[PDB]
Amino acid sequence: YYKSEIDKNGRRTYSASLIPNRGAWLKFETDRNDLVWVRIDKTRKLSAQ
């Protein structure tokens, strides 16, 4: 699923998120670069790749 959202101004990132049935997750987004990070749990990770 995807959830995007705003900053305090209107910087409107997005995200993404995955859920297995069972097993860990995979998170994504866009942090005022437009450039992104494969977070795993909440924000566990964060990699341009």
With contact defined as beta carbons under 8 Å apart, do 43 and 27 qualify?
A: yes
* Beta carbon nearer to DNA, 12 or 41: 41
C-alpha to C-alpha distance for 17 and 41, rounded to whole angstroms: 9
Contact positions with DNA (CB under 7 A) in 3-42: 19, 24-25, 41-42
Residues 44, 19, 27: CA angle, nearest 5 degrees: 35
Of residues 12 and 24, the one with the C-beta less far from DNA: 24
Q: Is 46 in the site for DNA (CB under 7 A)?
A: no
Which parts of this chain interact with DNA (CB under 7 A)? 19, 24-25, 41-42, 44
